[PDB]
Amino acid sequence: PDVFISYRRNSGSQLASLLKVHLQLHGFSVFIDVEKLEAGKFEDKLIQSVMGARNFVLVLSPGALDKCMQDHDCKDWVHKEIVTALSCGKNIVPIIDGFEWPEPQVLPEDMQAVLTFNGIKWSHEYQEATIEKIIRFLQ
Amino acid sequence: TPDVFISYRRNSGSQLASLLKVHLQLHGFSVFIDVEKLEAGKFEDKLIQSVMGARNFVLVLSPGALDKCMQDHDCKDWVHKEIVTALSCGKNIVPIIDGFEWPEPQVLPEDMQAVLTFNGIKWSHEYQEATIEKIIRFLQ
Ligand SMILES: C[C@@H](c1cc[n+]([C@@H]2O[C@H](COP(=O)(O)OP(=O)(O)OC[C@H]3O[C@@H](n4cnc5c(N)ncnc54)[C@H](OP(=O)(O)O)[C@@H]3O)[C@@H](O)[C@H]2O)cc1)N(C)C(=O)NCC(F)(F)F
Ligand SMILES: C[C@@H](c1cc[n+]([C@@H]2O[C@H](COP(=O)(O)OP(=O)(O)OC[C@H]3O[C@@H](n4cnc5c(N)ncnc54)[C@H](OP(=O)(O)O)[C@@H]3O)[C@@H](O)[C@H]2O)cc1)N(C)C(=O)NCC(F)(F)F
Description:
Two copies of one chain form a homodimer. Chain A has 139 residues and is an alpha/beta fold. The first copy, chain A, contains five helices and five strands, in the order E-H-E-H-H-E-H-E-E-H. Chain A has one domain (1-139). In chain A, strand 3, helix 4 and strand 4 form a beta-alpha-beta unit. In chain A, helix 3 (42-52) packs parallel to helix 4 (77-87). The longest helix of chain A has 17 residues, at 9-25. At the A-B interface, helix 1 of A face helix 1 of B. Chain B: The active site is at residue 82.
């Protein structure tokens, strides 16, 4: 798949699904867990799916990184997914939806670099234009 | 004139409402949602007129979506106004249940308590294609 979509279930489920529909309509193959994570040990499958996708779309809904803070053992799944994307040098594309930019030091050192990528503001009023800009960011 | 009017709460149902719009348009329906089709003029007339003109009334019941309607007996809340118009016009009302808690009828103004008597569709994150197929079957 061209695109891996990483998101928080309790706050980004609808936006992540909306993004999947739009990207598939423009010709991109998309991984989101509820449609592409199939049989087996999900720990391995999820990481392999991040490693295989050229683009890493990160849904930054309100508080999306809160469960990453102080996750020193790296047991939080958004944390694991971001570290994998960073380690593999993927095209990281953050989607900003009411997200408050935290200070880097509140985040584990192995994912602080996520804050250095250019993010795209999600606009409820200009969704077609938001989508067209996301397509420009994808490789 | 649109086949479907989508009623929703900005602060909790914005993304689901937009997702329903995309899916319904892909299946050949003309859809009204405010951010794409409410244009110039006094919006109070234009909003009520757009409910009246659509055969189907799709209501996004996200968590707490009817809270601002409670004790709104002056009918100044917009979801309240849209529901009342839909009920009064005998529209095909199709509630979409997304984590919604069913309230006792007595907490709502009497002119909209009937919205709770319509058969609602449970939104499933895991089975979204199947949810959309059921919504289409409910549309006229
Ligand atoms: C573990 C879970 C998972 C978690 C995280 N991500 C990635 O990470 C981000 C979301 O992160 P997140 O923080 O929002 O999500 P959670 O960690 O909170 O887990 C959410 C719910 O999955 C329940 N749950 C626990 N164990 C299992 C299990 N063996 N099988 C099925 N469900 C399980 C858990 O049950 P609970 O803990 O007892 O409540 C909780 O209900 C995204 O980017 C994602 O790709 C991916 C998958 N998982 C395999 C599925 O969902 N599989 C079903 C699917 F349809 F998706 F394939
Ligand atoms: C009044 C508002 C509106 C309200 C309700 N609905 C229906 O009702 C449900 C949503 O209900 P809701 O409870 O979620 O929405 P709100 O009542 O909270 O208001 C929403 C935000 O529109 C701000 N706002 C206040 N005055 C104006 C104004 N003259 N022009 C533009 N924006 C204004 C207000 O600013 P604020 O009050 O000062 O913060 C508040 O932020 C849906 O089904 C909807 O069809 C439709 C429209 N409106 C005309 C627009 O948005 N027009 C832009 C658009 F792109 F949509 F055309």
